[PDB]
Amino acid sequence: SDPLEEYCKDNPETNECRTYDN
């Protein structure tokens, strides 16, 4: 998918995007 998916995977702040809000 777009860099958006890989981000939430690689985002220590937004990879937590699923748990925390950013």
CSV table of C-alpha atoms in Angstrom, one decimal:
chain,number,residue,atom,x,y,z
A,1,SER,CA,0.0,0.0,0.0
A,2,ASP,CA,0.9,3.7,0.1
A,3,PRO,CA,3.6,4.9,2.5
A,4,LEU,CA,0.8,5.3,5.0
A,5,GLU,CA,0.7,1.6,5.8
A,6,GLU,CA,4.4,1.1,6.1
A,7,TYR,CA,4.4,4.2,8.3
A,8,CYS,CA,2.1,3.0,11.0
A,9,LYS,CA,4.4,-0.1,10.8
A,10,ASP,CA,7.6,2.1,11.2
A,11,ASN,CA,6.2,5.0,13.2
A,12,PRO,CA,7.4,4.7,16.8
A,13,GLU,CA,4.9,7.5,17.3
A,14,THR,CA,2.6,6.7,14.4
A,15,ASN,CA,3.3,3.0,14.4
A,16,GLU,CA,1.6,3.3,17.7
A,17,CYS,CA,-1.0,5.1,15.7
A,18,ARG,CA,-3.2,2.2,16.3
A,19,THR,CA,-2.9,2.6,20.1
A,20,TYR,CA,-2.0,6.2,20.7
A,21,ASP,CA,-3.1,9.3,18.7
A,22,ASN,CA,-0.7,11.4,16.6
